[PDB]
Amino acid sequence: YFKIYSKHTPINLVRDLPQGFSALEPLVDLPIGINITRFQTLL
Amino acid sequence: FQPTNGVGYQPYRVVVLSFATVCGPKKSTNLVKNKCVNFNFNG
Numbered sequence: 001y002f003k004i005y006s007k008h009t010p011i012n013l014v015r016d017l018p019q020g021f022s023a024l025e026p027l028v029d030l031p032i033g034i035n036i037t038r039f040q041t042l043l
Numbered sequence: 044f045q046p047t048n049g050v051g052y053q054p055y056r057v058v059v060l061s062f063a064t065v066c067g068p069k070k071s072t073n074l075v076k077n078k079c080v081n082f083n084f085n086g
């Protein structure tokens with residue numbers, strides 16, 4: 001099972017991550033069986 | 044594969060499969076409230 005857990009929040013700063021807490025919630029849970037050792041971003 | 048052949052040597056309307064990515068279908072009952080009952084929800 002490949003997983004994604006995810007969150008959205010408002011912010012006001014680009015150059016650091018927030019010193020505040022909010023947990024990430026599941027949206028993908030698929031028994032794809034493919035192992036993962038590498039990745040690349042799309043933008 | 045002629046339609047005129049007897050069902051032994053005639054063409055095969057035939058196929059097979061194994062039963063996780065998928066499983067056989069769950070049945071369900073009414074949601075019998077307030078009584079003492081045996082139950083299954085989602086397994």
Ligand SMILES: *[C@@H]1O[C@H](CO)[C@@H](O)[C@H](O)[C@H]1NC(C)=O
Pocket residue numbers: 033034035
């Ligand atoms: C994932 O790794 C195992 C060995 O740990 C390997 O047997 C399996 O084939 C790999 N998965 C895929 C999709 O190849």
